[PDB]
Amino acid sequence: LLEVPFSARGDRIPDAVAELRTREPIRKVRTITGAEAWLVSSYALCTQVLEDRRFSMKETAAAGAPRLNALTVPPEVVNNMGNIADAGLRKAVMKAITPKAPGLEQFLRDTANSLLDNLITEGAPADLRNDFADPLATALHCKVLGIPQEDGPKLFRSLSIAFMSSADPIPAAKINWDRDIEYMAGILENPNITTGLMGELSRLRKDPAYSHVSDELFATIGVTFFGAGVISTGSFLTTALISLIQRPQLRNLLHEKPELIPAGVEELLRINLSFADGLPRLATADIQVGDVLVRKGELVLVLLEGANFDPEHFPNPGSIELDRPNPTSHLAFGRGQHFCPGSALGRRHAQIGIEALLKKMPGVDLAVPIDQLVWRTRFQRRIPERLPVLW
Ligand code: HEM
Ligand SMILES: OC(Cn1cncn1)(Cn1cncn1)c1ccc(F)cc1F
Structure with a gap:
């Protein structure tokens, strides 16, 4: 059986994706747990799966379900956004994680420029x-959640283990989780925490209307959104920076015309290889996907x-083009029920980081050969351990 993932490299899509997509856009594979799954790889079939709620995210955590990787969190954390809604x-979560929050943009700006000024100072x-x-x-x-910088x-520190993509259970993941939860629970009891997501969650926790809502859940929300948001934006920006560095005339164009930076980041999102594995779903019914009857209980x-x-949706897909007619229609943030609630913020993080960096380091380039980057293995993202650059 063809094994997944194909490659831990985040800088280059394997040639075998284009071959697999045309001929077998749904194909049986084996995961690192040894479970079988259906790998879907065309825009047509990917959208089908994500738009069909009978392919369930929640149910991937069911006992005895075939698994992409070992659970690193309680089985109910996988249903966090549903739990959040039911409570x-x-x-409120959505209000907390909007990039429009007064002062947030300038905070990101000033934070980005300050980090860059420190690097330029250090040499x-x-x-x-x-x-x-x-x-x-x-x-x-930290700003978004209302917790101290x-x-x-x-x-x-927990994330290099929390977001592992392991064949086997991870002892350290439970230790770290309990400690982070304990941390967030104290943050909720802290009267000084009055801003951000945790400032809100704290005041809803006092109100007896929310008596039905557990303390586990409130604290879980903080831990979940911190980890998910930090790993995704941190990882995406890093590999987006490599894509940009490797395209000096794009780098030059965006430096000259910063108004095109949102279009650039949207393209960088479209071509991004940050997710190391397909998005998992468990079929809750027998469902036809292309030439395959996916059976109840199977992993997709x-x-x-x-x-x-996919060239059928994105012409010249390997090329970054700033004048595409439907540029936000990629699946970098998913689709349907579980579309990323942090997508707006993820955009602005990348846009502001890139704008800062292009202004401070217009001549940025790799300071090592690309083949010297060390790609993290058995992790839920594809990232280099270090990204050495000069300017
Ligand atoms: C460039 C940055 C980001 C990328 C590329 C990204 C990607 C994704 C994708 C692909 C999904 C769908 C997963 C699936 O359907 O199985 C998702 C969902 C989610 N994202 Fe993000 N994300 C980013 C930033 C963020 C941020 C900043 C946050 C929170 C502050 C966040 C929180 C979440 C949560 C809680 C879900 C689950 C939604 C649900 O189950 O309804 N993400 N994200
Ligand atoms: O953070 C996860 C996974 N995820 C991050 N981006 C998209 N999906 C769970 N996780 C797996 N390993 C460590 N944590 C998550 C967060 C929220 C949610 F509602 C579901 C969900 F799977």
């Missing part, structure tokens, strides 16, 4: 992952770069 906490080479993108992501999310680095993996590099 009536939805539009090249600079590691843009550990000393720019990830610290930017972490700073942002100095607390960011320690919560960040939605390969985002399958869809995103």
Whole structure:
């Protein structure tokens, strides 16, 4: 059986995706747990799966379900956004994680420029992952959640294990989770926390209307959104920076015309290889997908770069084009029921980070050969451990 994932490299799509997409856009594969799954790799079939609610995210956590990887969190964390809705906490979460919050844009700006000024002061080479993108992501999310900036680095520490993509259960993941939860639970009891998502969650927790809502859930929300948001924005910006560095005339164009930076980031999103695995769903019924009858109880993996590099939807898919007619129609944020609630913020993080970097380091380039980057393995994202650059 063809094994997944194909490659841990986040800088280059494997040739085998284009071949697999045309001939077998749904194809049986084996996951690292040894489970069988259906890998879907065309825009047509990927959208089908994500729009069909009978292909369930929640049910991937069912006992004895075939698994893409080992659970690193309680089985109910996989249903976090549903739980959030059922508790009536939805539009509050959404309010907290909008990039439009007064002062947030300028905070991101000033934070980005300050990180860059420190790198320019220290001298090249600079590691843009550990000393720019990830610290930017972490700073942002502390702001968003209303927790102290100095607390960011320690919560960040859990993510190299929390977002592993493991064949086997991970002892450390439970230890870290319990500790982070305990942390968030204290944050909720802290009267000084009056801003951001945790400032809100804290005041809803006092109101007896929300007596039905557990303390586990409130604290879980904080841990979940921090980790998910920090890993995704930090990881996406890092590999987006590589794509940009490798396209000097695009780098030059955006530096000259910063108004095109949103169009550039949308393209960088479309071609991004940050998700290491397809998005998993469990079929809750027998459902036809292309030439395959997917059976109740079976795992399906939605390969985002399958869809995103599909020439049937995106002409010249390997090329970054700033004048595409339907540019936001990629699947980098998913589709349907579980479309990323952080997508607006994820955009602005990348847009502002890139704008800062292009202005401070207009001559940015890799300071090592591309084949020297060390790609993290058995992780839910594809990222280089370090991104050395000069300017
Ligand atoms: C460039 C940045 C980001 C990317 C590429 C990204 C990607 C994704 C994708 C592909 C999904 C759908 C997963 C699926 O359907 O199985 C998703 C869902 C989700 N994202 Fe993001 N995300 C990003 C930023 C963020 C941020 C900033 C946050 C929170 C602050 C966040 C929180 C979430 C949550 C809670 C879900 C689950 C939604 C649900 O189940 O209804 N993401 N994200
Ligand atoms: O954070 C996850 C996964 N995820 C991150 N982006 C898109 N999906 C769960 N997770 C898996 N390993 C560690 N954490 C998550 C977050 C919220 C949610 F509602 C579901 C969900 F699977």
